[PDB]
Amino acid sequence: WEHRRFIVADSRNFITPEFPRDFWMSPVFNLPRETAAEQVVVLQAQRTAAAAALENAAMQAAELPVDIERRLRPIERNVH
Amino acid sequence: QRTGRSALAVLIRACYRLQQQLQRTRRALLHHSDAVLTSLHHVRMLL
């Protein structure tokens, strides 16, 4: 056995909250069609894309000091 | 005597200066690409 009090769950049990006068004039409920939060996500992704493109370009352009040596040395030994 | 000994002087001057012309290109084209590498490197720094 066991004992407790009880409250009937009737459909008439309602609740009455209080709203502030300036509650609904919030900058969050009222959102424009385009916000800057998304622009942050796009711009960060573009910056990160440019970061990896920089390394790709660096590994591409690292051959510039290399390509010049082997085009001049076999002609230098040819003249000498 | 003066004919054949002076005829080879043009070739001597040509070869002993072509030996330097390519050395200049060795030096001048390597002090310039290093700037490009440093610039790419600095751009990587900015990120």
- B23–A79 C-beta distance less than 8 A: no
- A79–B22 C-beta distance less than 8 A: yes
CA torsion angle A56 A60 A63 A67 (round to 10)? 180
Find all residues with CB under 8 Å of B25, minimum gap 6, and list them: A68, A72
Q: A57: which chain B residues are within 8 Å (Cβ-Cβ)?
A: 40
Q: B19: which chain A residues are within 8 Å (Cβ-Cβ)?
A: 76, 79-80
Q: Are A31 and B21 in contact (CB under 8 A)?
A: no
- B15–A55 C-beta distance less than 8 A: no
CA-to-CA dists, residue A32 to A29, A35, A36, angstroms? 10, 6, 10
